[PDB]
Amino acid sequence: PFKEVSPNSFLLDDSHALSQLLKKSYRWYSPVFSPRNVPRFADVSSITESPETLKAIRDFLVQRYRAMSPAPTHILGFDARGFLFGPMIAVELEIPFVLMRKADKNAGLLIRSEPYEKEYKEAAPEVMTIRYGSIGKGSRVVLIDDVLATGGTALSGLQLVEASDAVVVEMVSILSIPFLKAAEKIHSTANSRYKDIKFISLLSDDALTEENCGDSKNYTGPRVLSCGDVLAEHPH
Amino acid sequence: PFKEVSPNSFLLDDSHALSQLLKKSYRWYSPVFSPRNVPRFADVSSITESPETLKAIRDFLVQRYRAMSPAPTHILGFDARGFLFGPMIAVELEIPFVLMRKADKNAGLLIRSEPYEKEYKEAAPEVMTIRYGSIGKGSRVVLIDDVLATGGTALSGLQLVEASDAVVVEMVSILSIPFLKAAEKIHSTANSRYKDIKFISLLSDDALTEENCGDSKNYTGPRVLSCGDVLAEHPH
């Protein structure tokens, strides 16, 4: 079951088989072996390439929403890693999977989010969208993505669902980075207007150790190799 | 069953329930209501937001790969729309779902594709990657994406699987645009080196009519609305 680690922010108890599987499967990479400058980049591929882990995520969440009352009406996934988990849950629940993407990636009349201005040593916030009418009045939406880091896109999701005159069931993520205090900040911003938004995570990055490092040890070459170069490494 | 519309390019017979459901569900948008300058932008959301259609795609393809011999070992989906269909099939087949993404989106040591130079009135081709070792020697990979248009990324997929010393089972897409002759061009390029690559599609865009137009009729406003503006349209 989910334990409240902080107000309206729940974490799956680490005894659960899903939590153990995630801890075992996850792989993170350091700057030299990743595309972003963060200490540990948690690779979503380490999850999707694991059949057992992918199935455990699907089963747990589907069971969770089937037993939920009132039941969710929609699943809104974030571009692009949220697309990896949303559809397999939505197909079982038999509800629509809506896409949250940048305007230049979305079709139809769109509704755009309004991100806050960035703070010193910033990092530009993303304006995200959903098609106008993809979610209606009375819709109960589950927001999904792989990792809850700073919470920028989660806030975009909240704004878009609110603008649509619908309610957020909860923000679910496979992994959370509690240090970045996304849930805490969202829960207090603008006089606690989002205080009632529930956040659920299946694993905390604090559970990831050196054993989860996917970095190649004692490697001094480039991070990216051309397909022609890789071809020359074997008889073909 | 799949019919050969051209050498190694198969289309699901339009009598199939899956083909009928796709024709009924699909929605396309013209330039003013889409993010790309094409006559008809086939919106993948019209598929994912349709529970019945999403389930029909999952059931058909899963059944197809379970009855396949030798059975596929991996499913490689294209960023980001391929992420929408791959995982729900891979979870049932209990095989890995590998991600093909641009280098600045992928973790670990990567293998990059080598796209051809563009032709007059061009449109810059994308260099795509997969993590080195995500697919090994002897792997039988199914490539998946929503639409087969020019085939640029499909070729990247083929190159990456080939470089990995693995074989392509087939390139599958929900929708194909036969007019752009992607299958024909890939099958002849570089002295027919990819002649044996099978292409399967579930629906041809020629089946999409005006009835599938998602455009708002007699609308003169902007394509994108801010969440604040949408909020003012209803009591809140």
Side-chain angles (χ1 to χ4, degrees), chain B residues 95-141:
Chain B
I95 55 176
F97 175 72
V98 183
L99 293 59
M100 186 177 78
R101 321 194 64 178
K102 285 184 185 301
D104 63 3
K105 290 296 166 58
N106 253 353
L109 290 185
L110 313 175
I111 306 175
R112 71 170 180 260
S113 66
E114 303 178 353
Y116 298 159
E117 57 182 347
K118 40 188 189 178
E119 283 71 77
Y120 195 43
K121 295 304 176 182
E122 300 97 338
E126 318 168 84
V127 172
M128 299 291 282
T129 72
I130 60 168
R131 196 188 65 260
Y132 183 98
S134 54
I135 292 132
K137 176 178 182 182
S139 301
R140 296 180 294 279
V141 190

Side-chain angles (χ1 to χ4, degrees), chain A residues 33 58 92 108 112 132 225, chain B residues 33 58 92 108 112 225:
Chain A
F33 291 96
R58 192 280 306 281
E92 297 299 328
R112 71 170 180 260
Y132 183 98
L225 302 77
Chain B
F33 291 96
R58 192 280 306 281
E92 297 299 328
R112 71 170 180 260
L225 302 77

Side-chain angles (χ1 to χ4, degrees), chain B:
Chain B
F2 289 91
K3 302 171 59 169
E4 180 181 327
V5 300
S6 67
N8 271 146
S9 185
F10 304 78
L11 176 63
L12 186 59
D13 182 82
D14 68 12
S15 77
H16 200 291
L18 170 52
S19 180
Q20 302 276 251
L21 207 41
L22 285 171
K23 182 180 168 66
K24 178 189 177 70
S25 301
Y26 250 121
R27 288 300 179 277
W28 60 261
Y29 299 82
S30 67
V32 61
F33 291 96
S34 105
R36 233 185 163 292
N37 183 229
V38 293
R40 314 191 308 180
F41 187 101
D43 186 15
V44 75
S45 290
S46 64
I47 301 311
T48 65
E49 291 175 23
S50 173
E52 191 186 10
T53 311
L54 195 59
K55 187 175 180 173
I57 293 172
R58 192 280 306 281
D59 293 339
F60 183 89
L61 292 177
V62 165
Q63 286 156 7
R64 175 183 178 76
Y65 300 124
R66 277 189 178 142
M68 194 168 288
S69 209
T73 62
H74 297 80
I75 299 293
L76 171 66
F78 302 178
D79 188 354
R81 309 189 303 223
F83 290 3
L84 301 163
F85 305 100
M88 74 181 172
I89 298 172
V91 70
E92 297 299 328
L93 297 177
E94 297 179 348
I95 55 176
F97 175 72
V98 183
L99 293 59
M100 186 177 78
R101 321 194 64 178
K102 285 184 185 301
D104 63 3
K105 290 296 166 58
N106 253 353
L109 290 185
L110 313 175
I111 306 175
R112 71 170 180 260
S113 66
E114 303 178 353
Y116 298 159
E117 57 182 347
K118 40 188 189 178
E119 283 71 77
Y120 195 43
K121 295 304 176 182
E122 300 97 338
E126 318 168 84
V127 172
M128 299 291 282
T129 72
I130 60 168
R131 196 188 65 260
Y132 183 98
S134 54
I135 292 132
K137 176 178 182 182
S139 301
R140 296 180 294 279
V141 190
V142 173
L143 283 55
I144 192 169
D145 195 1
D146 71 328
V147 181
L148 178 66
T150 62
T153 39
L155 179 64
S156 281
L158 304 181
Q159 295 177 332
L160 293 170
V161 172
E162 169 177 51
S164 297
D165 205 5
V167 300
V168 172
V169 170
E170 61 194 19
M171 172 65 224
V172 56
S173 64
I174 307 302
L175 187 80
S176 56
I177 319 296
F179 175 71
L180 292 167
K181 294 157 190 168
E184 266 83 289
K185 297 175 182 180
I186 288 177
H187 281 152
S188 65
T189 196
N191 283 283
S192 308
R193 59 175 303 169
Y194 298 120
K195 179 188 179 182
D196 297 311
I197 295 298
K198 178 186 289 185
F199 284 87
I200 61 157
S201 193
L202 304 175
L203 188 78
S204 168
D205 82 315
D206 178 67
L208 300 187
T209 70
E210 178 56 30
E211 298 194 336
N212 296 95
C213 187
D215 285 358
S216 287
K217 292 181 180 178
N218 300 294
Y219 176 77
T220 62
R223 188 179 85 96
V224 185
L225 302 77
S226 64
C227 53
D229 285 352
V230 182
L231 265 174
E233 299 178 1
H234 62 264
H236 67 281

